Amino acid sequence: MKEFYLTVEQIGDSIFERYIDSNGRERTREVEYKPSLFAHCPESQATKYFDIYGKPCTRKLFANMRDASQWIKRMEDIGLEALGMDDFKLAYLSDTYNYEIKYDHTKIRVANFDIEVTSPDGFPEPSQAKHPIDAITHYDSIDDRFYVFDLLNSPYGNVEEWSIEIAAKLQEQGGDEVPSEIIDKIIYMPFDNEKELLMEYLNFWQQKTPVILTGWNVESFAIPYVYNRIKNIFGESTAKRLSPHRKTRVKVIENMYGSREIITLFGISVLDYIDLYKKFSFTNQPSYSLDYISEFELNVGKLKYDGPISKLRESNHQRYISYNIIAVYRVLQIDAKRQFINLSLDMGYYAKIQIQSVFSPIKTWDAIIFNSLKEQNKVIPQGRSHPVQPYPGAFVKEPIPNRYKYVMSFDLTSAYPSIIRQVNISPETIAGTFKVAPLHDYINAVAERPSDVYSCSPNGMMYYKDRDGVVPTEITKVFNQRKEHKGYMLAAQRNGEIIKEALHNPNLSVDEPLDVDYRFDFSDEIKEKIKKLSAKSLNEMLFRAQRTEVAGMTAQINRKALINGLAGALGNVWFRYYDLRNATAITTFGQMALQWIERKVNEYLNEVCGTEGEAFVLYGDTDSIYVSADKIIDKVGESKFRDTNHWVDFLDKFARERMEPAIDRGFREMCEYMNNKQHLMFMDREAIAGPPLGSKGIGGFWTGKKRYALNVWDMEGTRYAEPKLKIMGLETQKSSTPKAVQKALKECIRRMLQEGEESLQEYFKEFEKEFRQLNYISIASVSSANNIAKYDVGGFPGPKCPFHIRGILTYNRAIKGNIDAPQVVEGEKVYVLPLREGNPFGDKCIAWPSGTEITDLIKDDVLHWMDYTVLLEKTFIKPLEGFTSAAKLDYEKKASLFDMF
DNA sequence: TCGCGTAAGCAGTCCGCG
DNA sequence: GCGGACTGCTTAC
Ligand SMILES: Cc1cn([C@H]2C[C@H](O)[C@@H](COP(=O)(O)OP(=O)(O)OP(=O)(O)O)O2)c(=O)[nH]c1=O
Ligand SMILES: [Ca+2]
Ligand SMILES: [Ca+2]
Ligand SMILES: [Ca+2]
Ligand SMILES: [Ca+2]
Numbered sequence: 001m002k003e004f005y006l007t008v009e010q011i012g013d014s015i016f017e018r019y020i021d022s023n024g025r026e027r028t029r030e031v032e033y034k035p036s037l038f039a040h041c042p043e044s045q046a047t048k049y050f051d052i053y054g055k056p057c058t059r060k061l062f063a064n065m066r067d068a069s070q071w072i073k074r075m076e077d078i079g080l081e082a083l084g085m086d087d088f089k090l091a092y093l094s095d096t097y098n099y100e101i102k103y104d105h106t107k108i109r110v111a112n113f114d115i116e117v118t119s120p121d122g123f124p125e126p127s128q129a130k131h132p133i134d135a136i137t138h139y140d141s142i143d144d145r146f147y148v149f150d151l152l153n154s155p156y157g158n159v160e161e162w163s164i165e166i167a168a169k170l171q172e173q174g175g176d177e178v179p180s181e182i183i184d185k186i187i188y189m190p191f192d193n194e195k196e197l198l199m200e201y202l203n204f205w206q207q208k209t210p211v212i213l214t215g216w217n218v219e220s221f222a223i224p225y226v227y228n229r230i231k232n233i234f235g236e237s238t239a240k241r242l243s244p245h246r247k248t249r250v251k252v253i254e255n256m257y258g259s260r261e262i263i264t265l266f267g268i269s270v271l272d273y274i275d276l277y278k279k280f281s282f283t284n285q286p287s288y289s290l291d292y293i294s295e296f297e298l299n300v301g302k303l304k305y306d307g308p309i310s311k312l313r314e315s316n317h318q319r320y321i322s323y324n325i326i327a328v329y330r331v332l333q334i335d336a337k338r339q340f341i342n343l344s345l346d347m348g349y350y351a352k353i354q355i356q357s358v359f360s361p362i363k364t365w366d367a368i369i370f371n372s373l374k375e376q377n378k379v380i381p382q383g384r385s386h387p388v389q390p391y392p393g394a395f396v397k398e399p400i401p402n403r404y405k406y407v408m409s410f411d412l413t414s415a416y417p418s419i420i421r422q423v424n425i426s427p428e429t430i431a432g433t434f435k436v437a438p439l440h441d442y443i444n445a446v447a448e449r450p451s452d453v454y455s456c457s458p459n460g461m462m463y464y465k466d467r468d469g470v471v472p473t474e475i476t477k478v479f480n481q482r483k484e485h486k487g488y489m490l491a492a493q494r495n496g497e498i499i500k501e502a503l504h505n506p507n508l509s510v511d512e513p514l515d516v517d518y519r520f521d522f523s524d525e526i527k528e529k530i531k532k533l534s535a536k537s538l539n540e541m542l543f544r545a546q547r548t549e550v551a552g553m554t555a556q557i558n559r560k561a562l563i564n565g566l567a568g569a570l571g572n573v574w575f576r577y578y579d580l581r582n583a584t585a586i587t588t589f590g591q592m593a594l595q596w597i598e599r600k601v602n603e604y605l606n607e608v609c610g611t612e613g614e615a616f617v618l619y620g621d622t623d624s625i626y627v628s629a630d631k632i633i634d635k636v637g638e639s640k641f642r643d644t645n646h647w648v649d650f651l652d653k654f655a656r657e658r659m660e661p662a663i664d665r666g667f668r669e670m671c672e673y674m675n676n677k678q679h680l681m682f683m684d685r686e687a688i689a690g691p692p693l694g695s696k697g698i699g700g701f702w703t704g705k706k707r708y709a710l711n712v713w714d715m716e717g718t719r720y721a722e723p724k725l726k727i728m729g730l731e732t733q734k735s736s737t738p739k740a741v742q743k744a745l746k747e748c749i750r751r752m753l754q755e756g757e758e759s760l761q762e763y764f765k766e767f768e769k770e771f772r773q774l775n776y777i778s779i780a781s782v783s784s785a786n787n788i789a790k791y792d793v794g795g796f797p798g799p800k801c802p803f804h805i806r807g808i809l810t811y812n813r814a815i816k817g818n819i820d821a822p823q824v825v826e827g828e829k830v831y832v833l834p835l836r837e838g839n840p841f842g843d844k845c846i847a848w849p850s851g852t853e854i855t856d857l858i859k860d861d862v863l864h865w866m867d868y869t870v871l872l873e874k875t876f877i878k879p880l881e882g883f884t885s886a887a888k889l890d891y892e893k894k895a896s897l898f899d900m901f
Numbered sequence: 902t903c904g905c906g907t908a909a910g911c912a913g914t915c916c917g918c919g
Numbered sequence: 920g921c922g923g924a925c926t927g928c929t930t931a932c
């Protein structure tokens with residue numbers, strides 16, 4: 001097999017590399033790597049190395065990496081560019097793995113661990129590590145075993161051994177319901193004392209040294225706690241055994257409001273799953289506790305226990321250990337679903353970066369572009385300082401707030417990357433500038449043609465047409481990967497809908513789910529077999545289909561995010577290829593393209609409808625248009641349609657056969673107008689929306705920019721078994737809106753779009769009547785909470801104190817003196833409830849950590865004083881009044897006598 | 902919230918508006 | 920009351 005790296009580090013003048021050799025074995029080596037860097041040289045000086053602008057460079061070979069670094073400094077002192085890859089480990093990987101890397105995940109040691117620490121005096125600070133580590137569960141991917149390290153004797157209590165037999169039993173048997181599929185994979189090691197536990201953990205770690213290290217909050221908690229605790233007990237040299245090169249560094253992570261410390265373990269790649277989740281999941285969650293996320297992702301119940309966590313070990317050590325094991329397994333279950341580890345490996349090996357660098361599109365693209373240019377003996381420019389400067393973005397059309405009955409939407413495939421490729425936008429393809437006219441003059445095709453030589457953007461920039469830039473070339477490669485995976489995603493989605501249909505008529509049989517590849521549209525034979533399956537088998541197939549869809553979604557959307565991140569990186573000052581000329585070339589072309597095609601679509605439709613000046617495009621945002629189809633439907637007549645699916649088909653055909661050719665013609669003209677390198681503006685139909693045939697549903701409404709709802713029957717070629725709501729921006733989509741309120745508002749919208757005004761009025765009346773019985777957590781607002789200290793004036797709110805911050809200060813006063821009470825963590829999320837006047841908390845709201853029950857110290861008083869009236873008006877009624885006035889109906893039946901009878 | 906971009910919405914504070 | 924200036928937070932793209 002081909003060799004591949006596992007990790008790479010620079011330590012002084014050595015590269016330390018862990019890798020898999022040609023026999024599939026893990027090895028480590030220290031290499032005295034001599035880097036090269038570059039300087040411009042005379043034309044007379046024959047060379048094979050050229051910078052990206054074609055200027056000749058001489059290569060400078062250094063005796064060692066420190067000399068290379070010192071040379072860069074002196075070049076700055078002189079005031080000359082020092083060219084080349086200054087991150088020497090990326091250069092090392094480029095030299096050592098000068099081929100497309102084929103990796104084998106089965107050889108990569110992926111470790112998932114979690115620790116427990118009993119603490120009676122509040123949160124156990126990792127930087128102090130003053131409490132014993134009393135449990136570690138460490139799952140190893142190569143062994144496929146859960147290694148459980150259990151402390152039996154502690155200053156906080158001596159306990160009995162954990163019982164695997166009780167752990168396996170149902171909770172209804174008094175057990176812990178540790179999943180049966182992992183029971184035989186548990187290797188249980190009890191310890192008489194903490195020193196022997198930790199010494200054994202370190203010997204184990206030595207034997208089975210993680211390459212990828214993950215878990216939940218491991219980077220911010222478990223790793224620093226373990227490192228500092230071992231440091232406290234044994235000394236630094238022992239703690240550094242967590243690094244295979246015995247090198248560690250305290251790294252200070254800074255943000256706007258403060259900083260925190262992590263421990264960098266050289267020769268390990270830490271991918272904390274909470275951070276993978278935040279980057280790759282495209283959720284915004286009210287809470288990021290593992291319980292909350294597990295429930296959300298897996299539909300597993302919360303891990304239940306009595307009393308505070310600080311007393312769990314002494315009261316119920318059995319459960320204590322079982323929950324530590326389950327916590328590790330839940331992360332593995334989330335990854336089986338979401339596949340973020342697989343994603344990180346793919347992207348990291350593609351770029352030839354340290355795997356942990358997948359968190360950084362700047363680093364990822366820097367490496368991709370360096371490797372690409374190096375192949376041609378081209379030399380990358382030095383990174384430079386730039387002041388941060390604002391620049392313009394996308395165009396968003398102001399919609400007329402209204403109901404909109406029939407809507408067809410269209411948008412560009414990978415808009416910004418497509419613009420890059422079409423215009424040929426790249427650092428080295430800049431050809432010059434032209435004299436810009438107002439944007440509207442380009443939109444209306446009255447401005448002078450910018451160039452007869454070069455490919456142009458309406459921001460004034462011109463680009464070469466003879467050759468693709470490195471940015472277009474490399475962005476195309478990732479886009480193509482994205483496109484492949486999106487194909488699989490949509491296939492699994494469509495396959496999912498076939499199963500849902502078949503589920504209307506399940507067979508009374510005992511059979512099995514079919515063995516199929518859900519990434520490909522089911523053949524006729526598979527469809528026939530599905531129609532004969534039991535509900536049981538169908539449901540199992542649906543679950544598998546949806547898991548395949550999720551896998552495709554992860555692969556596609558994060559490749560989309562990477563290529564989109566390159567367009568954004570051009571506008572970030574730390575990017576080697578930062579250039580506002582290029583960043584604004586993209587966005588300004590985008591603005592033009594949307595408004596150009598709006599004009600073209602309106603023109604086309606006015607022509608087919610025989611009108612003038614009618615606005616068929618009602619909305620657009622960045623790269624999208626929403627087209628009113630009322631007139632199209634009315635031209636055949638609603639009476640002519642057999643059912644909902646009939647007019648959906650008719651609009652689908654109209655979009656494909658009439659609209660899309662019209663749009664394509666519009667964009668080809670624009671391409672020629674801008675003299676672009678290649679026409680790549682592909683604006684495909686997204687959604688077909690409308691009320692159910694014969695209903696009083698309104699179909700859709702807009703309240704304003706970035707705020708709308710549609711009842712969608714077909715989305716990017718997926719024809720739904722049941723209509724689906726596409727809701728953007730409205731309170732149903734915001735993590736700040738209470739859970740039960742999102743649900744209620746969604747049902748109000750459903751009724752509006754599908755059933756009409758009377759149905760809406762029915763539901764509102766019921767919700768208003770019953771909501772006071774909703775669980776307090778389900779009706780609490782949510783907010784991130786920054787700058788708690790800034791607004792805290794002796795325990796009370798200072799000037800301009802935000803409402804949620806006020807809530808926290810109230811909480812802080814109410815729990816004062818308690819070290820055991822849960823603390824609100826700066827920068828994390830809180831639940832927020834309003835309080836009625838005259839309450840014992842002395843203020844109008846209280847807040848507490850999100851994803852948790854409020855402490856029993858004050859729960860009863862919070863419940864008694866909760867202001868349901870304010871809660872209802874603020875979170876439910878106010879948004880609903882916005883929706884209904886926009887859509888021109890009433891959520892309450894207006895008095896129009898009779899009545900009178 | 903360490904790790905790519907801008908546009909733009911709503912809640913809430915403070916305070917004017919005769 | 921509500922709007923504008925402003926801070927804070929969150930979402931669409
Ligand atoms: C979603 C998203 C979009 N954008 C910008 C770049 C996108 O090309 C542009 C349009 O957004 P989208 O239409 O969401 O995405 P897309 O056109 O890149 O991909 P698709 O083929 O799935 O439609 O908006 C970002 O800069 N960051 C983001 O997170
Ligand atoms: Ca725990
Ligand atoms: Ca798009
Ligand atoms: Ca599309
Ligand atoms: Ca059947």
Ligand SMILES: [Ca+2]
Nearest residue numbers: 411412623624
């Ligand atoms: Ca779009």
